[PDB]
């Protein structure tokens, strides 16, 4: 519930989406550990894209947020819709055992 | 008419008598035997507290966070049937 | 298991008595000298519930009488309704 505070969450999600969609694609890195690699004029060291990956994992995880919610709805409504066949303390209850026994009563025939 | 409300009052007073009779019978059995009714209490009230504490991880603001799936191997209710629901096509 | 909006939920949105009673029962279930005292307390609690139940029984017996008396008047109308 509470739809007044959910628009304020979506406005902060879309703020970070519009912030990450304004970064340049030609982003490279330079760590302080490259001096042991001896980068020449044409070397192509393997520590250039250590932040360009992390600038895309966040941008594509903020877009698959509605994608993972469908998988969570398909998981929770399949592990919690029964809730009385794998959980032992809920199936060992006097009301639940009598209810599951009494819903399987076959109708009585006449004569 | 007044007969329906009168029978309602008689039925309510009979339910009060049934409550008083059951509360008498519980203390009467506790007076007859003191041993196997207190262990019965410590078992049945503990099971009733486990039943009433069986629906707490499915709230509104509790399921939208990530403190259900991540690092909760002590829960044992979920995150163990993902190898079973995938084999049935329920996703 | 991916925390994505878990930062934004934290940005937006920032008993003992019955356990002591259960521990008291667990201490009372060790010595046999206390169960007699518990039964002697429960005997007068059962006498209190006998006094609770008998007044409800007497009030039921009273409240039956007017519902019977209305049917007695309906019965006494028949002594002329049949003679006619």
């Amino acid at each position: 519930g509470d739809p007044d505070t959910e628009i304020r969450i979506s406005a902060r999600i879309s703020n970070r989406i519009n912030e990450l969609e304004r970064l340049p694609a030609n982003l490279g890195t330079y760590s302080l550990d490259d001096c042991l690699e001896f980068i020449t004029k044409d070397d192509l060291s393997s520590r250039m894209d250590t932040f360009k990956i992390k600038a895309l994992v966040e941008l594509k995880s903020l877009k698959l947020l509605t994608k993972q919610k469908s998988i969570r709805q398909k998981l929770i409504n399949n592990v919690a819709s029964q809730a009385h066949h794998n959980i032992p303390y809920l199936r060992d209850s006097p009301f639940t055992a009598a209810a599951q026994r009494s819903v399987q009563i076959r109708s009585k025939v006449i004569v | 008419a007044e007969d329906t409300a009168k029978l309602r009052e008689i039925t309510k007073l009979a339910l009060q008598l049934n409550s008083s009779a059951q509360k008498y019978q519980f203390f009467h059995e506790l007076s007859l035997h003191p041993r196997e009714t207190l262990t019965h209490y410590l078992w049945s009230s503990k099971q009733n507290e486990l039943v009433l504490q069986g629906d707490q991880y499915f709230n509104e603001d509790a399921a939208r966070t990530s403190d259900i799936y991540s690092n909760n191997n002590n829960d044992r209710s979920l995150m163990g049937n993902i190898s079973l629901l995938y084999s049935q096509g329920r996703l | 298991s991916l925390p994505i909006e878990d930062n934004y939920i934290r940005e937006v949105v920032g008993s003992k008595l019955m356990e002591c009673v259960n521990d008291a029962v667990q201490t009372l279930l060790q010595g046999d000298d206390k169960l007699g005292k518990v039964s002697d307390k429960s005997r007068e609690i059962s006498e209190k519930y006998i006094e609770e139940s008998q007044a409800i029984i007497q009030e039921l017996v009273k409240l039956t009488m007017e519902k019977l008396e209305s049917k007695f008047t309906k019965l006494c109308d028949l002594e002329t309704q049949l003679e006619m």
Partner: peptide
């Protein structure tokens, strides 16, 4: 405890917006 990493090297400054890196200035 698994926590989402706060990447401060990617985020832009809001209050000052003048002491940031030259690749994040535009």
């Amino acid at each position: 405890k698994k926590e989402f990493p706060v990447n401060l090297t990617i985020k832009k400054n809001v209050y000052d917006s003048a002491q940031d890196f030259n690749a994040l200035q535009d």
